[PDB]
Design a protein around this motif. Structure first.
Motif, PDB file in Angstrom:
ATOM      1  N   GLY A 171       6.109  -0.622  11.842  1.00  0.00           N
ATOM      2  CA  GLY A 171       5.631   0.432  12.324  1.00  0.00           C
ATOM      3  C   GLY A 171       4.801   1.379  11.386  1.00  0.00           C
ATOM      4  O   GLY A 171       4.096   2.562  12.018  1.00  0.00           O
ATOM      5  N   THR A 172       5.033   1.190  10.135  1.00  0.00           N
ATOM      6  CA  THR A 172       4.510   2.084   9.246  1.00  0.00           C
ATOM      7  C   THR A 172       3.061   1.651   8.734  1.00  0.00           C
ATOM      8  O   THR A 172       2.878   0.533   8.322  1.00  0.00           O
ATOM      9  N   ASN A 173       2.023   2.542   8.834  1.00  0.00           N
ATOM     10  CA  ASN A 173       0.691   2.475   8.440  1.00  0.00           C
ATOM     11  C   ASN A 173       0.180   3.070   7.250  1.00  0.00           C
ATOM     12  O   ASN A 173       0.566   3.972   6.691  1.00  0.00           O
ATOM     13  N   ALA A 174      -0.732   2.463   6.278  1.00  0.00           N
ATOM     14  CA  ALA A 174      -1.285   2.908   5.312  1.00  0.00           C
ATOM     15  C   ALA A 174      -2.818   2.581   5.187  1.00  0.00           C
ATOM     16  O   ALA A 174      -3.082   1.533   5.930  1.00  0.00           O
ATOM     17  N   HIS A 175      -3.521   3.462   4.875  1.00  0.00           N
ATOM     18  CA  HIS A 175      -4.979   3.355   4.644  1.00  0.00           C
ATOM     19  C   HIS A 175      -5.254   4.356   3.217  1.00  0.00           C
ATOM     20  O   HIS A 175      -4.679   5.130   2.923  1.00  0.00           O
ATOM     21  N   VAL A 176      -6.062   3.516   2.369  1.00  0.00           N
ATOM     22  CA  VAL A 176      -6.428   3.861   1.181  1.00  0.00           C
ATOM     23  C   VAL A 176      -7.955   3.790   0.839  1.00  0.00           C
ATOM     24  O   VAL A 176      -8.600   2.774   1.393  1.00  0.00           O
ATOM     25  N   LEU A 179       0.869  -1.355  -0.329  1.00  0.00           N
ATOM     26  CA  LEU A 179      -0.090  -0.133   0.058  1.00  0.00           C
ATOM     27  C   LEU A 179       0.858   1.478   0.012  1.00  0.00           C
ATOM     28  O   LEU A 179       0.451   2.409  -0.427  1.00  0.00           O
ATOM     29  N   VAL A 180       2.028   1.222   0.544  1.00  0.00           N
ATOM     30  CA  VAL A 180       2.932   2.364   0.540  1.00  0.00           C
ATOM     31  C   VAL A 180       3.418   2.537  -1.015  1.00  0.00           C
ATOM     32  O   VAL A 180       3.604   3.430  -1.308  1.00  0.00           O
ATOM     33  N   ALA A 181       3.504   1.344  -1.511  1.00  0.00           N
ATOM     34  CA  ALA A 181       3.915   1.459  -3.065  1.00  0.00           C
ATOM     35  C   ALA A 181       2.938   2.250  -3.776  1.00  0.00           C
ATOM     36  O   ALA A 181       3.186   3.057  -4.739  1.00  0.00           O
ATOM     37  N   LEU A 182       1.667   1.614  -3.457  1.00  0.00           N
ATOM     38  CA  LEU A 182       0.486   2.269  -4.233  1.00  0.00           C
ATOM     39  C   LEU A 182       0.749   3.766  -3.966  1.00  0.00           C
ATOM     40  O   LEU A 182       0.336   4.829  -4.839  1.00  0.00           O
ATOM     41  N   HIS A 183       0.662   4.194  -2.723  1.00  0.00           N
ATOM     42  CA  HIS A 183       0.685   5.798  -2.105  1.00  0.00           C
ATOM     43  C   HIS A 183       1.863   6.324  -2.855  1.00  0.00           C
ATOM     44  O   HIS A 183       1.501   7.720  -3.364  1.00  0.00           O
ATOM     45  N   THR A 184       3.044   5.768  -3.135  1.00  0.00           N
ATOM     46  CA  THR A 184       4.199   6.498  -3.896  1.00  0.00           C
ATOM     47  C   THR A 184       3.468   6.763  -5.322  1.00  0.00           C
ATOM     48  O   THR A 184       3.992   7.703  -5.773  1.00  0.00           O
ATOM     49  N   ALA A 185       2.936   5.443  -5.858  1.00  0.00           N
ATOM     50  CA  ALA A 185       2.753   5.873  -7.296  1.00  0.00           C
ATOM     51  C   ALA A 185       1.779   6.810  -7.425  1.00  0.00           C
ATOM     52  O   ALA A 185       1.851   7.588  -8.639  1.00  0.00           O
ATOM     53  N   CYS A 186       0.852   6.840  -6.609  1.00  0.00           N
ATOM     54  CA  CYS A 186       0.025   8.080  -6.660  1.00  0.00           C
ATOM     55  C   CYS A 186       0.592   9.393  -6.671  1.00  0.00           C
ATOM     56  O   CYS A 186       0.049  10.409  -7.388  1.00  0.00           O
TER      57      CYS A 186
END
Lengths: 846, 165, 144, 116
Positions: free
Chosen positions: A403-408, A162-169
């Motif tokens: 410890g790193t969190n993502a929400h989409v 999800l972090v990869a998705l967040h970066t691509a966005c």
């Protein structure tokens, strides 16, 4: 004029435990309420959830040696095959992406592949470092596909994808790419990750995640591959892509100082949920579904549920209770792929308009305050309430153990603006072509078997859609096949025919070739009463026929003359159908590398090549054919099966054409012919319906007269290389004067000679551009003499001057490697979900 | 050669039904797509529909609900019917030969001016409807009243000839 | 429906000059399905170009057609008298066949004065009923 | 690639200076980039172009013929641009094929504020 443009998900692919090898198989597993918990495989060398083909890789497809493939981390290989599948789901032939801003963002960590010493035999030295360093996981995709936006490998553990998705966005919003692949992959090669979580007591003995259940007793380790294709919504709509969902908003943050690096913090989880809502300009009431981190740990599940309560639980307002679930309950904890797996689950839901269910096992966790009644577990399929907007939305969560969190926030795609659809050349006949391609014949066969199985299991699918999709949304490879079909069921039968090796009508097979295409214009006896009438609906064709009508009358008083013959009408009409069929092939994308003609054919070929305008080309064939009706009466021609020299009595008949190794034309005196004919009643000879003999001296009478009539013509430099059957070589189009046109009527036609030369020069495909195959069989024989693989094709046929025949010709031209612009032929239909490329994977496991 | 002639009632009242027909001379009615194309005054042309010698039709969706075209193969003729007319439909209607379905047009009819109004034929006052008045004579211009405003004045459709100076 | 926007509104020039008439579509259209027409006044349209670039039989070679997706162009080498007319493009690739709004191609002359009548004047631009461009003086005449 | 970008159209701003901190410390691999950034930051402080340990002669494989790129030999003046702002470019090119280029600029003048 600038903001957080919505990003669109245009494709998706995944390989997950439980035998899931496509988004659709994932839907099956979730609605079945089966799980994937099983014992560790022995074939790895040290309970959990494991991929079917973790170590299988179609190495040869991507041009990778078996030694390098053995050195590649199975995660590198899954990422590369899943990236391909995702682009196929987006309906993008990956070649079109070579040299593109397309970016690659891969979430991943190390899983203990290649930790021992390298068995020298395996010979992996020089490949092991590159096959197993994190950056290559993403760099290799950009290398193999020629992609040229950012390529990164990111590790944030469970949230990695999800972090990869967040970066691509952000990459997309920022202009750093204009298309992105984003996802995560994990394959538990070694047992190190399993061992550390065992020692911690974090794993259920089941191997099963029981999210939010009273039976929660630890998480089940899993693995897999999950990838989506991202694109700014504007570009998506403009290119007419099939949008699956949209990333409306997403956020990332960190637990900070929890009670142990892995300890979870509900406050952090709340803040990341609320930044996402802010980026997406919504509130929790606008989200019906939450696809949670949801790992089934006794202490973490309540932490996740308390933050949902504190966020999605409050102010639900009109919106009824929020539905809650986790795909880990079916596939386990897919680690770096967990996030996008969740994202593909809710996207399957959006397709079907329902909330994807979760394997609820037991009673709700007594540790969670359900007293508000505001969160309900998604126990079976449910209605997906739109928001007050009328927009369905979900929330996906991944909380990593570092410890790193993502929400989409995933939202249904907006309604596309309707656009005027492009026209389809060739009238509709219910018959649609469906083309197949793979990198080997076995793969080609497998493709056909899978398309047939899909179409049998999924009927009602529109054949126009399968046609458009397999022609426009797939790459065309070396080994090809094509199947004409008027309805789904006829497709399945003929696709199975490809699959099983059967020769059947409506089915064609072939190899695509580099070499050029040569347009053969025959003349001779290609005519049949009513020819090519069924193509007069086609503007490309009808327009050519009309302009031909204009200049014929002015030079001969004649026209269509096929509303319902003799040499100075038939030749000006066969000329017209042949330059028309040529323009039709042109507008369907078949561009000729060279033109060649037989006698009069050379005049259509000179027009088709640009050496003579349509006007001069008509005048040349009208006053060459009026001039031949002036030496009627005595003279005739005959075909003689059997090769020349053997057929080479003199001063009355001579050889006037050579058409192949086993076919000659002989011509001269009328009576003299009947003599030879009834002589052979004891060789398969036959006389051509003619009242004169051309390519003989019977034509020297009309010389000087013809040369004069055609003195006003203006030969031009050709746009297409014109091969002269007379000269026996390429010839500037300026040289096609009246002299050339007399000498074409007089000298003998060395056609077998020319076909041999063009075969020598490496031309790959001969297309007889004529209303009936006239020379095709002779040409085919010439190629068998030269032991050639060049292909020969007709255009129209008697009892086949219909669009269905041209469609058949397009299908065979494409199967041999002729570039058919399927957009201009099958207009532009929609993209349907059909099986991917059929990877022919072998196992590689160091 | 090839030549097209069209005829039909030019003046109509609202809610009535336009009816023009076109005759093809010398051409091959078979295999070409006989078509109607209107042109509102001074504007761009607008395609109405087409029909081949078989009866296959194709109508502009903007008017399909109120348009019908037809062929008579033994007369070599084809025709346009346009229901529920309105002052929007005031145009020069043209019949033409299409080289293929919805294609380019080479041979064209002479054009039929079709005027949809609701004004009984009045006669000019010289100091008029319909509008074929004869006398720098400016083009006429329609008033809100419905009557055109613009020496031997001569209003044919009203048998009027002020011939005043 | 696909929209065709012609440009310029009304290109004025004089006999001999080179006239370049442009046409922009609301979306890309195959070059095989674009066409150009001339319309002398009170007559029917006459086909000039079909398939973007193919000259219709009988059309002088000075008329040239070109262009691709969205932007197509019609070009006359030397403006002869009978060329001054209105020109229309036509796309026939999108289901609804559609036409340009038109471009006028008028006579350019030395600016004259209007001499409520507006007598013979040029340019036609003015701040009713105007008269067509006269045959010998190429001026206009408005009537408010 | 530097010649085709920083070498074209300089127009009386002088050759761009060129250097690499790897000449003094080698390839720090993952820190190679920030290392270079810190190097140009060191320079920005002192108002001089930081030098590179140039060894031997300039590679004969390279077209020095425009004279638009010059090796940062020892310390040099850091010409500011017309803007008046001193800038530098930093490159790091990955062996997985991923490339980064960063423009570091001099900090803008602080808006002055009455002191507590």
């Amino acid at each position: 004029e600038l903001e957080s443009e919505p990003i669109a998900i245009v494709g998706m692919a995944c390989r997950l435990p439980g035998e899931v090898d496509s988004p659709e198989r994932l839907w099956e597993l979730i609605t079945s309420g089966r799980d994937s918990a099983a014992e560790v495989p022995d074939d790895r060398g040290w309970h959990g959830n494991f991929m079917a083909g973790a170590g299988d890789f179609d190495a040869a497809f991507f041009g990778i040696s078996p030694r390098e493939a053995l050195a590649m981390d199975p995660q590198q290989r899954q990422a590369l095959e899943t990236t391909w599948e995702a682009l196929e789901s987006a309906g993008i032939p990956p070649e079109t992406l070579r040299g593109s801003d397309t970016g690659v963002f891969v979430g991943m960590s190390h899983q203990g592949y290649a930790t021992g010493r390298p068995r020298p035999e395996d010979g992996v030295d020089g490949y092991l470092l590159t096959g197993n360093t994190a950056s290559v996981a993403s760099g290799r995709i950009a290398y193999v596909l020629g992609l040229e936006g950012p390529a990164l490998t990111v590790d944030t553990a469970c949230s990695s994808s999800l972090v990869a998705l967040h970066t691509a966005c952000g990459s997309l919003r920022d202009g750093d790419c204009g298309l992105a692949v984003a996802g995560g992959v994990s394959v538990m090669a070694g047992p190190e990750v399993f061992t550390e979580f065992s020692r911690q007591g974090a794993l259920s003995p089941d191997g099963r995640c029981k999210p939010f259940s009273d039976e929660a007793d630890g998480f089940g380790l899993g693995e897999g591959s999950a990838f989506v294709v991202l694109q700014r919504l504007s570009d998506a709509r403009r290119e007419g892509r099939r949008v699956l969902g949209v990333v409306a908003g997403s956020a990332v943050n960190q637990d900070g100082a929890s009670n142990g690096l892995s300890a979870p913090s509900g406050v952090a989880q709340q803040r990341v949920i609320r930044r996402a809502w802010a980026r997406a300009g919504i509130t929790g009431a606008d989200v019906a579904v939450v696809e949670a981190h949801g790992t089934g740990t006794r202490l973490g599940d309540p932490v996740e549920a308390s933050a949902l309560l504190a966020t999605y639980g409050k102010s639900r307002g009109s919106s009824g209770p929020v539905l809650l679930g986790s795909v880990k309950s079916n596939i386990g904890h897919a680690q770096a792929a967990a996030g996008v797996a969740g994202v593909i689950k809710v996207l399957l839901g959006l397709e079907r308009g329902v909330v994807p269910p979760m394997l609820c096992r037991g009673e709700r966790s007594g540790l969670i305050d359900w007293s508000s009644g505001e969160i309900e577990l998604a126990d079976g399929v449910r209605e997906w309430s739109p928001a007050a907007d009328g927009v369905r939305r979900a929330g996906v969560s991944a909380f990593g153990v570092s410890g790193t969190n993502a929400h989409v926030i995933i939202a249904e795609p907006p309604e596309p603006e309707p656009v005027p659809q492009p026209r389809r050349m060739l009238p509709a006949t219910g018959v649609v072509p469906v083309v197949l391609s793979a990198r080997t014949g076995a793969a080609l066969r497998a493709q056909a078997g899978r398309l047939a199985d899909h179409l049998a299991a999924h009927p009602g699918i529109a054949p126009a859609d399968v046609s458009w999709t397999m022609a426009r949304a797939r790459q065309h490879f070396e080994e090809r096949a094509a199947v004409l079909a008027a309805d789904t069921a006829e497709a399945v039968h003929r696709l199975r025919a490809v699959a099983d090796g059967a020769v059947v009508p409506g089915v064609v097979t072939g190899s695509a070739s580099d070499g050029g295409s040569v347009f053969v214009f025959p003349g001779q006896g290609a005519q049949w009463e009513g020819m090519a009438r069924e193509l007069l609906p086609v503007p490309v064709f009808a327009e050519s026929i009309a302009e031909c009508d204009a200049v014929l009358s002015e030079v001969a008083g004649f026209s269509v003359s096929e509303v319902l013959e003799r040499v100075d009408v038939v030749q000006p009409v066969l000329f017209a159908v042949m330059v028309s069929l040529a323009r039709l092939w042109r507008a369907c994308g078949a561009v000729p590398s060279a033109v060649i003609g037989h006698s009069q054919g050379e005049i259509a070929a000179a027009v088709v090549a640009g050496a003579l305008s349509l006007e001069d080309g008509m005048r040349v064939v009208a006053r060459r054919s009026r001039a031949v009706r002036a030496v009627a009466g005595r003279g005739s021609m005959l075909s003689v099966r059997g090769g020349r020299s053997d057929v080479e009595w003199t001063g009355r008949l001579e050889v006037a054409a050579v058409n192949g190794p086993d076919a000659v034309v002989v011509a001269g005196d009328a009576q003299a012919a009947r003599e030879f004919l009834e002589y052979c009643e004891g060789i398969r000879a036959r006389a051509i319906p003619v009242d004169y003999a051309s390519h003989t001296a019977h034509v020297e009478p009309v010389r000087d007269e013809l040369v004069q009539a055609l003195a006003g013509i203006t030969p031009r430099r050709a746009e297409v290389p014109f091969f002269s059957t007379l000269t026996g070589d390429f010839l500037d189009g300026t040289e096609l004067d009246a002299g050339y046109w007399y000498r074409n009527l007089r000298h003998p036609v060395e056609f077998h000679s020319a076909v041999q030369a063009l075969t020598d020069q490496g031309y790959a495909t001969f297309i007889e551009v004529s209303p009936h195959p006239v020379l095709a069989s002779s040409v085919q024989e010439t190629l068998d003499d030269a032991e050639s693989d060049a292909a020969v094709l007709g255009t129209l046929e008697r009892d086949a001057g219909d669009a269905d025949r041209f469609l058949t010709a397009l299908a065979d031209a494409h199967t041999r490697g002729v570039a058919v612009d399927w957009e201009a032929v099958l207009g532009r239909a929609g993209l349907v979900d059909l099986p991917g490329y059929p990877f022919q994977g072998k196992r590689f496991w160091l | 050669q090839v030549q097209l002639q069209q005829w039909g009632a030019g003046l109509l009242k609202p809610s009535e039904t336009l009816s023009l027909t076109c005759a093809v001379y010398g051409g091959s009615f078979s295999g070409y797509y006989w078509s109607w194309i209107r042109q509102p005054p001074g504007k761009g042309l607008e395609w109405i529909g087409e029909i081949n010698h078989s009866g296959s039709t194709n109508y502009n969706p903007s008017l399909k609900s109120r348009v019908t075209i037809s062929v008579d193969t033994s007369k070599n003729q084809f025709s346009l019917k346009l229901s529920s007319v309105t002052a929007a439909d005031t145009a020069v209607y043209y019949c033409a030969r299409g080289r293929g379905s919805s294609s380019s047009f080479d041979y064209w009819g002479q054009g039929t001016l079709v005027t949809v109004s609701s004004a009984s034929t009045k006669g000019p006052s010289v100091f008029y409807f319909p509008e074929p008045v004869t006398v720098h004579t400016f083009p006429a211009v329609l008033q809100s009243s419905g009557l055109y405003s613009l020496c031997n004045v001569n209003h044919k459709p009203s048998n009027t000839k002020v011939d005043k100076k | 429906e696909t929209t065709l926007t012609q440009s310029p509104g009304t290109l004025s020039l004089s006999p001999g000059e080179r006239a370049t008439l442009s046409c922009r579509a609301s979306q890309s259209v195959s070059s095989y399905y674009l066409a150009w027409y001339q319309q002398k006044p009170g007559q029917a349209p006459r086909l000039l170009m079909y398939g973007a670039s193919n000259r219709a039989t009988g059309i002088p070679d000075r008329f040239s057609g070109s262009g691709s997706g969205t932007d197509f162009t019609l070009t006359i080498a030397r403006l002869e008298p009978e060329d001054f007319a209105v020109y229309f493009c036509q796309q026939y690739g999108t289901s609804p066949q559609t036409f340009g709004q038109g471009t006028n191609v008028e006579i350019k002359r030395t600016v004259a004065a209007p001499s409520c009548l507006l007598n013979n004047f040029y340019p036609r631009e003015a701040k009713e009923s105007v008269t067509e461009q006269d045959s010998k003086d190429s001026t206009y005449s408005l009537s408010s």
